[PDB]
Every structure is written in structure tokens, then in C-alpha cells.
């Protein structure tokens, strides 16, 4: 059931030029389902579409959709780590 | 001088299908130069080509170059955070 | 002026058994002041009391104050990384 | 068996003033065991002693042991996030 749900989100995302709004805690709900899961079969499929959906959304935020209201915080954090210069100050 | 150097790395990266080998501590050296810098002019240019080079390399690792020997550790860490399911276990 | 302000927060924190409420963006405001600063003298002092205040608050959250309403999100994130088992799932 | 092993490391750590050397990938091995585990009973015990050992080692690095050769990289990263001022530069 989770396998089919992530596919729909993936197939919806690949259809549109703009980033899609995801439910708050979309990825956290996937994580909580993972603790439940007891069958390697659906696990690899969930891992696959988790990877593919997130790869595509990162690409859209990087090059296609300047607007980022539909990025979840954990996705904006990845975009920021990619794009911004972070410098660490030490006592030395 | 740093402005022109990052451009060369950017223009070299956009030329080739595979990820390019970067010197160890390539980004850390950019960070240390930032502490030196005292002129907003070169700063924005360094920030721009830092962003653009890293965006492109992420894209190559995501979709173009399965091999990741030329990803620096901080870049592999971003790819991993994108692609892999991380679950946190709590006492609850 | 920032040097004296962090001291007060430090001397207030060492006085009480419970974690103190900090203003939202307390640390972010320190970061933004750092970009302003142009004098190594106050810089090392700000770095010192930044370190010492945060060390103490981590210790209080770890062993003294079970309540965490007064931890800022970036501090709770450090406590969580210390205390919780995080496992990364890969395709392999 | 993992339950008893973490206890020994915990009881050894509480005995000595200095940080103890841990095997490389000590925590990663605990993570890989977690994927194996199928019995909530040992799970909560492993989570408990994982928390307690790491809390104590953080405390030793913060206040007791200036030397950090025996901190594993993921522990040094937590110490650094506690102690050092990290500033993010944006295009704005």
C-alpha cells in the first residue's frame, strides 16, 4: 500500500514543472512505516521510489522552481547545504 | 584570483559527462579564503560559482555518473541524505 | 557589547538548576553579528562564551533538566544526535 | 549479547578519567545489529546503554579530556557542533 502511494506521488511530480505540495511529515510517515515493515519485498520498492521522488524534487528546486514554499524543511536543508557557503570558526 | 579559479572548475565540469576529480579540501580552501576576504565584490562572485559548480556536480552524481570516486566526502554526504532512508529510533 | 551580553547569559545559566529560556534566534543573532565584526579582539571573546554557554546547556539537558521546552531547536538536534540511534538504510 | 557488550564499554568508560579508545565503526556496528534485531526486549536495553555511553563520552570531551584522539569522527562532529560558531553565507 505504501509502495503504490509513493509511485503516485512520483508520477504526479514528474508531470508538472513546479514543485508539488507534500503533506507535512510526508517523509517522517515513510520512516515510521519502515519500522513497521517486516517484508524485504515492499522495503526495496519503498526505498526505490523514496530515492527517485527526492532526486527529482531536488532537481526541480535546483534548476526549475525558484519558489520553495512547497519544499519541506528537510528538503530546503539539503538545498541550502548544496548552495550556501558554510564556514566554521575555531579558536585555533 | 579565486573568482577566476572557480570559473575554470565550473567551465571544466560543464564540459564532461563524468564527475571531475577535485583536490582534497577544495571546498575547505574556499571557506578559508572567505575568512580572508574583505571586498563584497569578489565575495558574491565566489558565492555564485560555488553554488553553480556544486549544483551541477550534484546533478551529475544523481543522474549522470553512477561512479562516485570523484565525489568529495561532503558531496557524498549530500547525495546520501538525498537518496537514503534515515530512521531515528527513540525511547518513547 | 556582544561580549558582555553573552557573559550575562552565561552567568545566569550557571546560577540555576534548570535550562533557561533563550530568545528565539539567540544563536542566529550571534552568527549575524559575527559577519559584522571587524576586530579579532571581541571575536575570540564571543567565540569563548558561545562555547562555554552551549557546553553548559548541553550538560544540563543531558543530566540535570529532563524538561526540554527551553532548548532551542538547534540544541535539541544536538541532544537527539547524542542520545538516539540513527540508522541509514541503503539499496546495497 | 550486544546488551552485555555495551554495558562493559559503559562500565569501563565510567571508571577512567580519560576518553577510552573505541574500535573503528563501534557505533556503525551497533546500527547494523539494530537492523538484525527482532526482539523489543534487547532493543530498549541497547538503546539505553547507547545513550548513556555517548552522554558520558560527550561530557568527558567537553570538560575532562582535552585530548580527542579517542573520539570517533561522529563524536568529534558533535563536539564541534557544540563548541564552534558556524555561519552560513547566503546570496540575499
DSSP string, C10-45: HHHHTT-SSPPP--TTHHHHHHHHHHH---HHHHHH
Q: Which of A27, C74, B61 is nearest to B53 (CA)?
A: B61
C-beta of residue A88 within 8 angstroms of C-beta of residue D84 = yes
Decide the pairing of beta strands A85-89 and B85-89.
Answer: unpaired
How near does any CA of chain A get to the CA of C60, in Å? 24
- Report in angstroms the alpha-carbon separations of C60 from C9, C18, C20, C72, D55: 15, 7, 10, 13, 11
Q: Which of A38, A21, A24 is nearest to A2 (CA)?
A: A38
D88: closest chain A residue by CA: A86
Size of interface B-D (CB pairs under 8 A): 14
Three-state DSSP at B88 gives strand
Method in brief? X-ray
Biggest CA pair distance of chain B = 54
B90: closest chain D residue by CA: D47
Instruction: Output DSSP code: residue B39.
Output: -
Three-state DSSP at B92 gives coil
Quoted resolution (Å): 2.2
Q: Which of A27, A31, A17, A15 is nearest to A67 (CA)?
A: A17
According to CATH, what is the number of the domain D1-83?
1.20.58.1030
Interface touch A91/C34, C-beta < 8 Å? no
C-beta of residue C72 within 8 angstroms of C-beta of residue C23 = no
Q: How far apart are CA D68 and CA A22, in angstroms?
A: 43
Q: How far apart are CA A8 and CA C45, in angstroms?
A: 54
Q: Which residues contact B72 (CB under 8 A, 6 or more apart)?
A: B22, B24, B26, B27
Helix axes A26-36, A2-13, angle to 10 degrees: 150
Q: How far apart are CA B53 and CA C1, in angstroms?
A: 39
Phi/psi for A59 (5° steps) reads -60, -40
Q: How far apart are CA D81 and CA A62, in angstroms?
A: 27
Of B31, B62, B88, the CB nearest to A55: B62
Q: Which of C37, C19, C6, B40 is nearest to D87 (CA)?
A: C37
Amino acid at each position: 500500500t505504501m509502495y503504490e502511494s509513493l509511485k503516485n506521488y512520483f508520477f504526479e511530480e514528474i508531470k508538472n514543472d513546479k514543485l508539488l505540495k507534500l503533506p507535512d511529515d510526508f517523509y517522517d510517515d515513510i520512516r515510521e512505516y519502515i519500522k513497521n515493515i517486516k517484508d524485504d519485498i515492499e522495503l526495496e520498492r519503498v526505498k526505490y521510489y523514496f530515492k527517485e521522488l527526492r532526486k527529482l524534487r531536488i532537481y526541480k528546486a535546483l534548476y526549475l522552481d525558484n519558489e520553495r514554499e512547497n519544499l519541506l524543511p528537510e528538503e530546503l536543508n539539503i538545498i541550502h547545504a548544496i548552495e550556501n557557503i558554510v564556514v566554521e570558526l575555531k579558536i585555533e
